[PDB]
Coordinates of C-alpha atoms in Angstrom, one line a residue:
Chain A
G12 CA 53.4 62.4 -25.8
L13 CA 52.7 59.3 -27.9
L14 CA 55.5 56.8 -27.3
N15 CA 55.1 56.3 -23.6
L16 CA 51.5 55.4 -24.2
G17 CA 52.5 53.2 -27.1
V18 CA 55.0 51.1 -25.1
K19 CA 52.4 50.5 -22.4
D20 CA 50.0 49.0 -24.9
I21 CA 52.5 46.3 -25.8
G22 CA 53.8 46.5 -22.2
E23 CA 54.8 42.9 -21.3
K24 CA 56.0 39.8 -23.1
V25 CA 56.7 36.6 -21.2
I26 CA 58.7 33.6 -22.3
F27 CA 58.7 30.4 -20.2
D28 CA 61.3 27.7 -20.2
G29 CA 60.2 24.5 -18.6
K30 CA 61.8 23.4 -15.4
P31 CA 61.0 21.2 -12.4
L32 CA 59.5 23.3 -9.6
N33 CA 61.5 21.2 -7.0
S34 CA 59.0 21.9 -4.2
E35 CA 57.5 19.5 -1.8
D36 CA 54.5 17.1 -2.6
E37 CA 52.0 19.1 -4.7
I38 CA 50.4 18.8 -8.2
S39 CA 51.9 22.3 -9.0
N40 CA 55.1 20.5 -10.1
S41 CA 53.3 18.6 -12.8
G42 CA 51.4 21.8 -13.9
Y43 CA 54.6 23.9 -13.7
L44 CA 53.9 26.7 -16.3
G45 CA 56.9 27.7 -14.4
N46 CA 58.8 30.8 -13.7
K47 CA 58.3 33.8 -15.9
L48 CA 61.2 35.8 -17.0
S49 CA 58.8 38.7 -17.3
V50 CA 60.0 41.6 -19.5
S51 CA 58.6 45.1 -19.8
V52 CA 59.3 48.6 -21.0
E53 CA 58.3 51.6 -18.8
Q54 CA 59.8 54.6 -20.8
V55 CA 61.3 55.3 -24.1
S56 CA 62.7 58.7 -25.2
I57 CA 64.9 60.1 -28.0
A58 CA 67.6 62.1 -26.3
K59 CA 69.1 64.2 -29.2
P60 CA 70.9 64.2 -32.6
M61 CA 73.9 65.9 -30.9
Chain B
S241 CA 81.8 46.6 43.7
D242 CA 83.0 44.3 41.0
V243 CA 82.6 43.9 37.3
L244 CA 80.7 41.0 35.7
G245 CA 81.3 40.0 32.1
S246 CA 78.1 40.1 30.2
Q247 CA 79.1 39.5 26.7
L248 CA 81.9 38.6 24.3
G249 CA 82.2 40.0 20.8
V250 CA 84.0 37.8 18.4
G251 CA 85.6 40.4 16.1
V252 CA 88.0 37.7 14.8
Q253 CA 90.6 40.4 14.6
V254 CA 93.2 42.3 17.4
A255 CA 90.7 44.9 18.6
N256 CA 92.7 48.1 18.8
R257 CA 89.8 50.4 19.5
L258 CA 86.4 50.1 21.0
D259 CA 83.5 52.5 21.7
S260 CA 80.1 52.2 23.2
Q261 CA 77.0 54.0 22.0
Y262 CA 74.9 56.5 23.9
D263 CA 71.5 54.5 26.8
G264 CA 74.1 52.8 24.6
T265 CA 73.0 49.5 23.0
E266 CA 75.6 49.0 20.3
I267 CA 79.3 48.6 20.7
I268 CA 81.8 49.3 18.0
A269 CA 85.0 47.3 17.7
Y270 CA 87.8 48.3 15.5
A271 CA 89.9 45.6 14.1
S272 CA 91.9 45.0 10.9
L273 CA 90.2 47.2 7.9
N274 CA 86.9 47.1 9.6
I275 CA 84.7 48.4 12.3
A276 CA 82.1 46.0 13.6
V277 CA 78.9 47.0 15.2
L278 CA 77.2 44.7 17.7
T279 CA 73.9 45.1 19.3
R280 CA 74.4 44.3 23.0
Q281 CA 70.7 44.8 23.7
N282 CA 70.1 41.4 22.0
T283 CA 71.8 39.1 24.4
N284 CA 72.0 35.6 21.4
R285 CA 73.5 38.1 19.0
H286 CA 76.6 36.2 17.9
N287 CA 77.3 38.3 14.9
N288 CA 77.6 42.0 14.2
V289 CA 74.7 43.9 12.9
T290 CA 76.8 46.1 10.6
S291 CA 80.3 46.4 9.4
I292 CA 82.1 49.4 8.1
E293 CA 85.2 48.9 6.0
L294 CA 87.5 51.9 6.7
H295 CA 91.0 50.7 5.6
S296 CA 94.0 49.0 7.4
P297 CA 94.2 48.3 11.2
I298 CA 92.0 50.7 13.1
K299 CA 93.6 52.8 15.8
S300 CA 90.6 54.8 17.1
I301 CA 86.9 55.3 16.8
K302 CA 85.0 58.1 18.4
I303 CA 81.3 59.0 18.4
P304 CA 80.2 62.5 18.4
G305 CA 78.0 63.7 21.1
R306 CA 74.7 63.3 20.1
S307 CA 75.7 60.0 18.6
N308 CA 74.8 60.5 15.0
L309 CA 78.3 60.3 13.7
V310 CA 81.3 58.1 14.0
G311 CA 84.9 59.0 13.2
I312 CA 87.4 56.3 12.3
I313 CA 91.0 56.7 12.2
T314 CA 93.8 54.4 11.0
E315 CA 95.9 55.1 7.7
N316 CA 96.1 58.5 5.9
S317 CA 92.4 59.1 5.7
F318 CA 89.9 59.5 8.5
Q319 CA 86.4 58.3 7.7
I320 CA 83.3 59.9 9.0
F321 CA 80.1 57.9 9.1
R322 CA 76.5 58.8 9.4
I323 CA 74.8 56.5 11.7
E324 CA 71.3 57.6 11.1
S325 CA 68.6 56.0 9.1
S326 CA 75.6 53.8 8.4
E327 CA 77.3 55.0 5.3
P328 CA 80.4 57.0 4.8
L329 CA 79.6 60.7 5.1
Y330 CA 82.9 62.2 4.3
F331 CA 86.6 61.5 4.4
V332 CA 89.5 63.6 5.7
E333 CA 92.8 62.9 4.1
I334 CA 96.0 64.1 5.8
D335 CA 99.7 63.9 4.8
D336 CA 100.6 61.8 7.8
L337 CA 100.5 58.1 7.1
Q338 CA 98.8 57.1 10.2
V339 CA 96.7 58.2 13.1
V340 CA 97.0 56.8 16.6
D341 CA 94.2 58.5 18.5
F342 CA 91.2 60.8 18.1
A343 CA 89.4 63.3 20.3
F344 CA 86.2 65.3 19.6
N345 CA 85.6 68.9 20.9
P346 CA 82.9 69.2 23.5
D347 CA 81.1 71.6 20.6
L348 CA 81.4 68.7 18.2
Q349 CA 82.8 71.1 15.7
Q350 CA 86.4 69.9 15.8
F351 CA 88.2 66.6 15.6
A352 CA 91.7 66.2 17.0
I353 CA 93.9 63.7 15.3
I354 CA 97.0 62.2 16.8
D355 CA 99.5 61.7 13.9
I356 CA 102.3 59.2 13.6
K357 CA 104.6 62.1 12.7
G358 CA 103.8 63.6 16.1
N359 CA 101.8 66.4 14.9
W360 CA 98.3 67.1 16.2
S361 CA 95.8 67.8 13.5
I362 CA 92.8 69.9 14.1
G363 CA 90.0 69.4 11.6
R364 CA 86.9 71.4 11.1
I365 CA 84.2 68.8 10.6
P366 CA 81.4 70.8 8.8
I367 CA 84.7 72.1 5.5
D368 CA 86.6 69.0 6.3
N369 CA 89.7 71.2 6.3
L370 CA 92.7 71.2 8.6
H371 CA 92.4 74.4 10.6
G372 CA 95.6 74.0 12.6
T373 CA 98.3 71.7 13.7
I374 CA 100.3 71.7 16.8
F375 CA 103.7 70.1 16.5
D376 CA 105.9 69.4 19.5
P377 CA 106.5 65.7 19.7
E378 CA 109.5 64.5 17.9
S379 CA 107.6 61.1 17.5
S380 CA 104.2 59.7 17.1
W381 CA 101.4 61.1 19.3
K382 CA 99.9 58.1 20.9
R383 CA 97.0 59.5 22.9
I384 CA 95.0 62.6 23.8
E385 CA 92.2 64.0 25.9
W386 CA 90.6 67.3 26.7
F387 CA 90.7 69.3 29.9
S388 CA 87.4 69.4 31.8
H389 CA 87.1 73.0 31.0
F390 CA 87.7 72.2 27.4
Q391 CA 90.2 75.0 27.2
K392 CA 93.2 72.8 27.2
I393 CA 94.2 69.7 25.4
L394 CA 96.7 67.1 26.5
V395 CA 98.6 64.6 24.5
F396 CA 101.1 61.9 25.1
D397 CA 103.7 60.7 22.7
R398 CA 106.6 58.6 22.4
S399 CA 108.4 59.6 25.7
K400 CA 106.7 63.0 26.5
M401 CA 103.4 64.5 27.5
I402 CA 102.3 68.0 26.5
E403 CA 99.5 70.4 27.3
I404 CA 98.1 72.7 24.7
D405 CA 96.1 75.8 24.7
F406 CA 93.0 75.6 22.6
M407 CA 94.1 78.9 21.3
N408 CA 97.2 77.4 19.9
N409 CA 100.6 77.1 21.6
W410 CA 101.9 74.5 24.1
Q411 CA 101.6 75.3 27.8
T412 CA 103.7 72.6 29.4
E413 CA 105.4 69.3 29.0
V414 CA 106.5 66.4 31.1
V415 CA 109.4 64.2 30.2
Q416 CA 109.5 60.5 31.1
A417 CA 112.1 57.8 31.0
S418 CA 109.4 55.7 28.8
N419 CA 107.0 55.8 26.0
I420 CA 103.5 57.0 26.8
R421 CA 100.8 54.8 25.4
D422 CA 97.7 56.2 27.0
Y423 CA 96.3 59.1 29.0
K424 CA 93.1 60.5 30.5
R425 CA 92.0 63.7 32.1
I426 CA 89.9 63.5 35.2
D427 CA 86.4 64.8 34.5
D428 CA 86.5 66.6 37.9
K429 CA 89.8 68.2 37.0
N430 CA 93.2 68.4 38.7
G431 CA 94.3 64.9 37.7
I432 CA 95.9 63.4 34.7
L433 CA 96.4 59.7 34.4
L434 CA 99.4 58.5 32.3
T435 CA 99.8 55.1 30.9
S436 CA 103.4 53.6 30.8
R437 CA 104.3 50.3 32.6
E438 CA 103.6 52.3 35.6
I439 CA 100.5 54.4 35.8
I440 CA 101.2 57.9 36.9
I441 CA 98.6 60.3 38.1
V442 CA 100.0 63.8 37.7
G443 CA 98.6 66.7 39.6
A444 CA 97.7 69.3 37.1
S445 CA 99.9 72.4 37.3
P446 CA 101.2 70.5 41.3
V447 CA 104.7 68.9 41.4
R448 CA 103.4 65.9 43.4
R449 CA 102.2 62.9 41.6
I450 CA 101.1 59.4 42.5
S451 CA 102.6 56.3 40.9
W452 CA 100.9 53.0 40.9
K453 CA 102.3 49.6 40.1
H454 CA 99.9 46.9 39.2
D455 CA 101.0 46.2 35.7
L456 CA 103.7 43.6 35.1
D457 CA 103.8 45.2 31.0
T458 CA 103.0 48.4 29.1
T459 CA 99.7 50.0 29.9
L460 CA 98.0 50.2 26.5
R461 CA 95.0 52.2 27.4
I462 CA 93.2 54.0 30.2
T463 CA 89.9 55.7 30.7
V464 CA 88.3 57.7 33.5
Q465 CA 84.8 57.1 34.6
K466 CA 82.4 59.9 33.9
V467 CA 81.6 60.2 37.6
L468 CA 86.1 60.9 37.8
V469 CA 85.7 58.8 41.0
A470 CA 87.7 56.0 39.4
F471 CA 89.4 55.0 36.3
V472 CA 90.6 51.9 34.6
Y473 CA 93.8 50.9 32.8
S474 CA 94.5 48.0 30.5
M475 CA 97.8 46.3 30.0
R476 CA 99.8 44.0 27.8
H477 CA 99.9 41.7 30.7
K478 CA 96.3 40.8 30.2
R479 CA 95.0 42.8 33.1
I480 CA 92.3 45.4 33.4
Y481 CA 92.6 47.3 36.6
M482 CA 90.1 49.7 38.2
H483 CA 91.5 52.4 40.4
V484 CA 90.3 55.2 42.8
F485 CA 90.6 58.8 41.7
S486 CA 94.0 60.3 42.3
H487 CA 96.1 58.4 44.9
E488 CA 94.8 54.4 42.7
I489 CA 93.6 52.2 45.4
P490 CA 92.7 49.0 43.6
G491 CA 88.9 48.6 43.4
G492 CA 89.0 45.5 41.3
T493 CA 91.1 43.6 38.8
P494 CA 90.0 41.4 36.0
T495 CA 92.3 39.0 34.3
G496 CA 91.8 38.5 30.6
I497 CA 93.0 35.8 28.3
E498 CA 95.3 38.0 26.4
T499 CA 96.6 41.6 26.2
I500 CA 94.0 44.3 26.6
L501 CA 94.6 46.9 23.9
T502 CA 91.7 49.2 24.3
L503 CA 88.8 50.2 26.5
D504 CA 85.8 52.4 26.9
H505 CA 83.3 53.3 29.6
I506 CA 79.6 54.0 29.0
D507 CA 78.5 57.6 29.5
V508 CA 76.4 56.2 33.0
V509 CA 79.5 54.3 34.3
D510 CA 77.4 51.2 33.9
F511 CA 79.5 49.3 31.4
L512 CA 83.1 48.7 30.4
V513 CA 84.3 47.4 27.1
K514 CA 87.7 46.1 26.4
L515 CA 89.4 45.0 23.3
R516 CA 91.8 42.1 23.3
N517 CA 94.7 40.4 21.7
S518 CA 92.5 37.4 21.5
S519 CA 90.8 39.1 18.6
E520 CA 87.7 39.8 20.6
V521 CA 86.0 42.4 22.8
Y522 CA 84.6 41.9 26.2
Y523 CA 81.7 43.7 27.7
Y524 CA 81.4 44.1 31.5
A525 CA 78.7 45.4 33.6
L526 CA 79.9 47.4 36.5
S527 CA 78.0 46.7 39.7
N528 CA 77.4 49.1 42.5
Chain C
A107 CA 128.1 88.5 11.9
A108 CA 126.6 85.2 10.5
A109 CA 123.8 87.1 8.9
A110 CA 126.2 89.5 7.1
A111 CA 128.1 86.6 5.7
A112 CA 125.0 85.0 4.2
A113 CA 124.1 88.3 2.5
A114 CA 127.5 88.5 0.8
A115 CA 127.1 84.9 -0.6
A116 CA 123.8 85.8 -2.1
Chain D
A211 CA 113.6 62.3 0.2
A212 CA 117.3 63.1 -0.3
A213 CA 116.5 64.6 -3.7
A214 CA 113.7 66.8 -2.1
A215 CA 116.1 68.0 0.6
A216 CA 118.7 68.9 -2.1
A217 CA 116.0 70.8 -4.0
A218 CA 115.0 72.7 -0.8
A219 CA 118.7 73.6 -0.2
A220 CA 119.1 74.9 -3.7
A221 CA 115.9 77.0 -3.3
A222 CA 117.3 78.4 0.0
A223 CA 120.6 79.2 -1.7
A224 CA 118.7 81.0 -4.6
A225 CA 116.7 83.0 -2.0
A226 CA 119.9 84.0 -0.2
Chain E
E130 CA 112.9 54.4 -6.0
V131 CA 111.5 57.9 -6.0
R132 CA 112.3 60.1 -9.0
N133 CA 115.2 62.4 -8.6
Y134 CA 113.8 65.9 -9.0
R135 CA 110.4 65.1 -10.5
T136 CA 108.6 62.9 -7.9
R137 CA 109.8 64.9 -5.0
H138 CA 108.8 68.1 -6.6
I139 CA 105.3 66.8 -7.3
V140 CA 104.8 65.6 -3.7
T141 CA 106.1 68.9 -2.3
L142 CA 103.8 70.9 -4.6
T143 CA 100.8 68.9 -3.5
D144 CA 101.7 69.5 0.1
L145 CA 102.1 73.2 -0.6
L146 CA 98.7 73.2 -2.3
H147 CA 97.1 71.7 0.8
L148 CA 98.7 74.4 2.9
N149 CA 97.4 77.1 0.5
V150 CA 93.9 75.7 0.9
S151 CA 94.2 75.7 4.6
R152 CA 95.2 79.3 4.5
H153 CA 93.8 81.3 1.6
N154 CA 96.7 82.1 -0.7
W155 CA 95.0 83.5 -3.7
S156 CA 98.5 84.0 -5.1
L157 CA 99.9 80.7 -3.9
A158 CA 96.9 78.8 -5.3
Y159 CA 97.4 80.5 -8.7
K160 CA 101.0 79.6 -8.9
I161 CA 100.9 76.4 -7.0
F162 CA 98.0 75.2 -9.0
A163 CA 99.8 76.1 -12.3
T164 CA 102.9 74.2 -11.1
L165 CA 100.6 71.3 -10.1
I166 CA 99.1 70.9 -13.6
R167 CA 102.4 69.3 -14.8
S168 CA 91.0 62.9 -11.6
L169 CA 90.7 65.6 -8.9
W170 CA 90.3 69.3 -9.1
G171 CA 88.0 70.2 -6.2
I172 CA 90.7 72.4 -4.7
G173 CA 91.1 74.0 -8.1
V174 CA 87.3 74.6 -8.2
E175 CA 87.5 75.7 -4.6
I176 CA 90.3 78.2 -5.2
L177 CA 88.5 80.0 -8.0
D178 CA 85.4 80.5 -5.8
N179 CA 87.5 81.3 -2.6
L180 CA 89.8 83.7 -4.4
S181 CA 88.5 85.6 -7.4
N182 CA 90.3 88.0 -9.8
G183 CA 83.4 84.6 -12.1
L184 CA 84.5 81.2 -10.8
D185 CA 82.0 79.2 -13.0
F186 CA 84.3 78.1 -15.9
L187 CA 86.7 75.4 -14.6
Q188 CA 83.9 73.3 -13.1
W189 CA 82.2 73.2 -16.5
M190 CA 85.3 71.9 -18.1
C191 CA 85.8 69.3 -15.4
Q192 CA 82.2 68.1 -15.7
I193 CA 82.6 67.8 -19.5
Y194 CA 85.5 65.2 -19.4
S195 CA 84.9 61.4 -18.8
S196 CA 81.2 61.5 -19.6
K197 CA 80.8 58.3 -21.8
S198 CA 80.0 55.3 -19.7
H199 CA 76.4 57.2 -6.7
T200 CA 76.0 58.8 -10.1
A201 CA 78.9 61.2 -11.1
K202 CA 80.9 63.2 -8.5
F203 CA 82.2 65.9 -10.9
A204 CA 78.6 66.8 -12.0
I205 CA 76.1 66.9 -9.2
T206 CA 78.2 69.8 -8.0
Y207 CA 78.1 71.8 -11.3
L208 CA 74.4 71.9 -11.3
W209 CA 74.2 73.4 -7.8
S210 CA 76.7 76.2 -8.6
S211 CA 74.4 77.2 -11.5
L212 CA 71.2 77.9 -9.5
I213 CA 73.1 79.6 -6.7
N214 CA 75.0 81.7 -9.3
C215 CA 71.6 82.7 -10.9
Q216 CA 70.3 83.6 -7.4
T217 CA 72.1 85.6 -18.2
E218 CA 69.1 83.4 -19.4
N219 CA 67.9 80.6 -17.0
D220 CA 65.5 78.8 -19.2
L221 CA 68.7 77.7 -20.9
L222 CA 69.9 76.1 -17.7
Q223 CA 66.7 74.4 -17.2
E224 CA 67.0 73.0 -20.7
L225 CA 70.4 71.7 -20.0
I226 CA 69.3 70.1 -16.8
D227 CA 66.6 68.2 -18.7
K228 CA 69.1 67.1 -21.3
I229 CA 71.3 65.6 -18.6
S230 CA 68.4 63.8 -17.0
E231 CA 67.5 62.4 -20.4
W232 CA 70.9 61.0 -20.9
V233 CA 71.1 59.6 -17.4
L234 CA 67.9 58.0 -16.2
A235 CA 70.4 62.9 -5.3
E236 CA 68.4 62.4 -8.5
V237 CA 69.0 65.6 -10.5
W238 CA 65.2 65.6 -11.0
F239 CA 64.9 67.1 -7.5
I240 CA 67.4 69.8 -8.4
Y241 CA 65.5 70.5 -11.7
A242 CA 62.2 70.8 -9.7
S243 CA 63.9 73.3 -7.3
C244 CA 65.2 75.4 -10.2
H245 CA 61.7 76.1 -11.6
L246 CA 60.5 77.1 -8.2
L247 CA 62.9 80.0 -8.2
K248 CA 61.4 81.3 -11.4
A249 CA 57.9 81.1 -9.9
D250 CA 58.8 83.3 -7.0
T251 CA 60.0 86.0 -9.3
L252 CA 56.8 85.6 -11.3
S253 CA 54.7 85.7 -8.1
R254 CA 55.7 89.2 -7.0
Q255 CA 55.9 90.8 -10.5
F256 CA 52.3 89.5 -11.0
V257 CA 51.1 90.8 -7.6
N258 CA 52.0 94.4 -8.5
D259 CA 49.5 96.7 -10.2
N260 CA 52.1 98.6 -12.2
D261 CA 46.4 96.1 -12.8
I262 CA 45.9 93.1 -15.2
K263 CA 43.5 90.0 -15.0
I264 CA 44.7 87.0 -17.0
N265 CA 48.1 86.4 -18.7
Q266 CA 50.8 86.2 -16.0
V267 CA 48.4 84.7 -13.4
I268 CA 47.5 81.8 -15.8
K269 CA 51.2 81.3 -16.6
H270 CA 52.1 81.2 -13.0
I271 CA 49.4 78.7 -12.3
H272 CA 50.7 76.4 -15.0
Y273 CA 54.3 76.7 -13.7
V274 CA 53.1 75.8 -10.2
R275 CA 51.3 72.7 -11.5
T276 CA 54.4 71.6 -13.4
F277 CA 56.6 72.1 -10.3
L278 CA 54.1 70.0 -8.3
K279 CA 54.3 67.1 -10.7
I280 CA 58.1 66.7 -10.6
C281 CA 58.3 66.7 -6.8
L282 CA 55.6 64.1 -6.5
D283 CA 57.4 61.6 -8.8
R284 CA 55.7 69.1 2.9
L285 CA 57.6 72.2 3.5
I286 CA 58.2 72.7 -0.2
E287 CA 54.6 72.2 -1.1
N288 CA 53.6 74.7 1.6
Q289 CA 55.9 77.3 0.3
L290 CA 54.6 77.0 -3.2
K291 CA 51.0 77.5 -2.0
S292 CA 51.9 80.6 -0.2
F293 CA 53.6 81.9 -3.2
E294 CA 50.6 81.4 -5.5
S295 CA 48.3 83.2 -3.0
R296 CA 50.5 86.2 -2.9
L297 CA 50.6 86.5 -6.7

């Protein structure tokens, strides 16, 4: 059907909260886009009006 | 010969029951509420690979066979685990509050359960139903074993030993002064080892018996080698003794730190495992 | 004798 | 247990 | 401590019920179970199938209670009884199966896939017979086979389906 295709189109939204990487010596800590609490939707379906 | 201790398994509990896998590589120790599995093949191997949480203290574990399943007995329910890639396959719940010992039929179809009430429960593994129950013993049945022919079954209880037909009814019984903690039937046949302070070898069906004294306290457990040539018994007085078939010439005697509650022998008479009061298991390699 | 007595009681 | 026993006895009596 | 008459009676009744299951007591189960009504019910489900006097209804009621909320123990059983029992209109059952799967997303999907397969086998032999027609049923059977193939995907089974199509 249509909805499954529709959810895929707007499939992922990512919000990043800044935090120190806390790794060893590397410039990646300064660049920390960070860790991505990736979110997605793989399937949506109306069950019934029962 | 002699036995050399290869490994120690720190269960951290006392180990009431232990089994070895079959070319066995894992040993299973039953403690209190859990069954620990250790891979002996990996000599540092300090900790157990897997743990199965059955219930309260564990009286007995038995592996079928081929070696796919494991049956654990303690409280009211008996747990059957699938060790094949373990997880609980099924559970058998009986009225009796506890089970002292377990035995598997040779065609792996039946489980025999030694109940505290004294009754013997026969369970059909496939239905997980109780086909039949033999009651004789007043009190708790402590131990059991199967006749070499597999036709008969022998059990010991508090103060008596009884022989049962597979068909049903009790063939015979022996009365003793004390409690009977453990028993074994010789694989060859014609010999029954009984575990009291004394160890008595009873001739099946003759009057004559042999009595051996090498235990100071109660003999908690006994097992015959598969070969039948010799057997071992364990005692409260921390000793594991190996004896010759029938009339028990002492082959060798290990002294452990504490009481030796349980024991098992590998299917090819290579290794011996004992469970101890010291909350550990000891693994021995038998040497030619 | 004992069996007969039981029947009477019933 | 006692109660159970009593019940059993009663049942037996009834049967008789 | 224990109740005077009531606790002891319940324990004894349960013990008697266990004895009845050990030995079939169609009559004992009927009266013992009734006395016992005063979770669990597998023995009750078992007695209806073991001793008949049409054992499908009780399981459905048990499955219906405690729905709101691995997977559910009451249920995965009820589904199996259905297909075996069929072995009334099936389509309906297939519909129900889908409904359950929708609500809850051992997977039920596998069971659903198996159920269609049974219908295909019936379709396969009816189609093979002359009493002689070229499109209709053959096309329907092909569609059913493709549908069955999709569900399993998301060796023995596949082989069987193929044999079936060829015969048709």
